[PDB]
UniProtKB/TrEMBL annotation, chain A:
One of its GO terms (biological process) is peptidoglycan biosynthetic process. Its EC number is 2.4.99.28. This is Peptidoglycan glycosyltransferase MrdB. It is found in: Cell inner membrane; Membrane. Belongs to the SEDS family. MrdB/RodA subfamily. Pathway: Cell wall biogenesis; peptidoglycan biosynthesis. It is a multi-pass membrane protein. The gene is mrdB. Keywords: Cell inner membrane, Cell membrane, Cell shape, Cell wall biogenesis/degradation, Glycosyltransferase, Membrane, Peptidoglycan synthesis, Transferase, Transmembrane, Transmembrane helix. It comes from Escherichia coli. It holds the Pfam family FTSW_RODA_SPOVE. NCBIfam families: PRK10794.1, rodA_shape. It catalyses: [GlcNAc-(1->4)-Mur2Ac(oyl-L-Ala-gamma-D-Glu-L-Lys-D-Ala-D-Ala)](n)-di-trans,octa-cis-undecaprenyl diphosphate + beta-D-GlcNAc-(1->4)-Mur2Ac(oyl-L-Ala-gamma-D-Glu-L-Lys-D-Ala-D-Ala)-di-trans,octa-cis-undecaprenyl diphosphate = [GlcNAc-(1->4)-Mur2Ac(oyl-L-Ala-gamma-D-Glu-L-Lys-D-Ala-D-Ala)](n+1)-di-trans,octa-cis-undecaprenyl diphosphate + di-trans,octa-cis-undecaprenyl diphosphate + H(+).
UniProtKB/TrEMBL annotation, chain B:
It is found in: Cell inner membrane; Cell membrane; Membrane. Residues 262-487 form the Penicillin-binding protein transpeptidase domain. It holds the Pfam family PBP_dimer. GO terms for biological process: cell wall organization; peptidoglycan biosynthetic process; proteolysis; regulation of cell shape. This is Peptidoglycan D,D-transpeptidase MrdA. InterPro entries: Beta-lactam/transpept, Beta-lactam/transpept-like, PBP_dimer, PBP_dimer_sf, PCN-bd_Tpept, Penicillin-binding_protein_2. The active site is at 320 (acyl-ester intermediate). Belongs to the transpeptidase family. MrdA subfamily. Catalyzes cross-linking of the peptidoglycan cell wall. The keyword Protease applies. Keywords: Carboxypeptidase, Cell inner membrane, Cell membrane, Cell shape, Cell wall biogenesis/degradation, Glycosyltransferase, Hydrolase, Membrane, Peptidoglycan synthesis, Protease, Transferase, Transmembrane, Transmembrane helix. GO terms for molecular function: glycosyltransferase activity; penicillin binding; peptidoglycan L,D-transpeptidase activity; serine-type D-Ala-D-Ala carboxypeptidase activity. It is a single-pass membrane protein. It comes from Escherichia coli.
Amino acid sequence: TFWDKVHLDPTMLLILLALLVYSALVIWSASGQDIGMMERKIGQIAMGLVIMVVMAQIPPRVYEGWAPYLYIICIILLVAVDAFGRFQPSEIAKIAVPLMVARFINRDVCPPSLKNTGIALVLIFMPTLLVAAQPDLGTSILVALSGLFVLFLSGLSWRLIGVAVVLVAAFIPILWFFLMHDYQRQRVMMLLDPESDPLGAGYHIIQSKIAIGSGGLRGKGWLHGTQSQLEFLPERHTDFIFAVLAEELGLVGILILLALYILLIMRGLWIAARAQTTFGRVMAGGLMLILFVYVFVNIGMVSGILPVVGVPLPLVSYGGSALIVLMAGFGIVMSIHTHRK
Amino acid sequence: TAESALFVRRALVAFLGILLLTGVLIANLYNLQIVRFTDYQTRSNENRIKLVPIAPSRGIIYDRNGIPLALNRTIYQIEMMPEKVDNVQQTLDALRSVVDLTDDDIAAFRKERARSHRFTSIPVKTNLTEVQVARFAVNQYRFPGVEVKGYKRRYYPYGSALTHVIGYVSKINDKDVERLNNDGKLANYAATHDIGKLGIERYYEDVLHGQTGYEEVEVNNRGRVIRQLKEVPPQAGHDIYLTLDLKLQQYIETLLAGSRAAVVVTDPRTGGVLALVSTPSYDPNLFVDGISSKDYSALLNDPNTPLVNRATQGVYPPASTVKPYVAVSALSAGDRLSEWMGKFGYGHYTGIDLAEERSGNMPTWTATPIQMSKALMILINDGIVKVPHLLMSTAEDGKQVPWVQPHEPPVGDIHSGYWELAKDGMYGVANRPNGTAHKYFASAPYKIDHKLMTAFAPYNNPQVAVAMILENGGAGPAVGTLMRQILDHIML
């Protein structure tokens, strides 16, 4: 009963430490043996651990109580950043909107009320998605899906989901016939097909595919030490760090990384299903599902199937904001897990 | 409680969804790197598999007769990788000792050493001679990473003949790179280094360029394609067939010489522009093969202003050339004349196949020679409007398709005698003693300070219409005699 006293989850902390060590080694490989970048990455990891532990202390009831204020300040500062033409606060958005959504759900009937509550939640969503999509679309998808998972887990009626799916699937062909004007549809095809149009947007994706094919076999390919050819694709240490991982570790490295990511997701959902109050029941689920969205979006990026989108791989890359926000999510999850009654 | 079970079910569904997505990703990777195992096929680590762009064979510009106008030869260059050279200075000295490399070339290399994005090719020498290529080939092994490569640089066999009309292709700088980024065209332009800055090379830049190829070639040391695996064929630029008569172009230029000026001969029947001429016509090969700052500056400040294509950029007052059109407007209307001229084409882009065209001003007066050509075309056609297009045809499945004129509201009514009145007036001016141009076409067996003049020889069913300007009076005889032998040569 020591970890609970510290308000930390041993299993999540251990898996996250293993994944952080693996990320450190991968960055060493992908940094060109750069001492400064490795020092900065270790500093970012330490800051992430500290913020995770700090966030794991404040009780979930405080999270529910302050969710309205955090959401309000986040929306105000997103309106600010969208205005004036500082630090990109989308991380605050994707850690805040699930909180506000979970609070609003918790303050209503057990399953959400059709077009009485779900409409309110989606209306909370739309300003956030609009503000986080006006500058760029990448983080907007994450911001939406993160709390759409909260709504889905809250008990959103399958009737509404099916109706929406049917309506969108009926509107797409109409968009595919009446709104198929030549250059709009051509641009849509270009965006949808990354590997297409080489030498441009698809240039780096094709280089990444060549990288993953080369030394990507289950035979581990060439191992570690930057014994690779991965400066063909720039920013090999931030976005295509998965390309570096593949080319320098084979298929086994990718499988191990994905196994760690799925283990983290399973533990998070397992402790979310045990949360007493519905707010913490759905918040942890939303956080874990958005983490998997990160993983899948980035791996599809590098393997060359999803459109072009700037979603850094979770906590295995160079960059603090994404690391610290994921760590804060994990801290919220552990607080929910340990505070219990 | 109910909520616990509901959340458990919804979380299980989401977990199954993410498991399916993970399966999708793993299947992608297995297909991409396991089944597609030959993506490396690299026995020696030093080899790469860089995705080499394939520049397409730029469309060869022909003319009416069909002879080539601008060609594409293989010019050789000295290439090396900055990041795979043991000693830059020793290698540069060795180049100086084998290919007589000049210190100015060293300075240019150093300028580009930083300018050119790192981790890529860097050129040092241009217009490499055959003897130098042979020397490098026989002593190639004595250099760390230097390799000679031949790159198709647009050749203009007639050179100063058609430079403003055909255009020139010059190096892509950062401004062009960002301009193409705005249009998302870097994909189709990665291979090519020289891109049209004017002439037909620009307006039909996309037509004459076409889709650029690419290839995944496993290159060993010295950057040699040895294990080409995947390669989309490059869509060779469609060979535009201009409405040009190169013989007429040469004749006009030869009879022009120093006289600065521009000549826009045309053919009202088909709408083409038989001869587009500009006097200075700086040599185009200078721009293609790494024009230096000194020569470019000399051209820019040159009093003759060779960089100005007088056919389009030349915005000059038509003076008396507008009299037929004002007469037609008056006969068709018993500042409305401004609207009538705008309908004719003055004051607006003529649709000519030259993106570098200055529209000019329509006072409510400067009109380019092609604008006068369009006005005369409309005059010949009794109001039917034809764009002064230079593209007679292009390359297609059938390898030839005539240029289709975009119909637009014809001015006035065709079945009106007003147009014939203007034609008869011009014919009388050209073939009557009271007329000023009579002395220049009296002996024609067939009826026919800047100094401009426009006319059409075959009054009955005209087949050639001309409008040209003699800048600052040129240096030869009066423009009338010039057009006289121009017409004489046009149909003998």
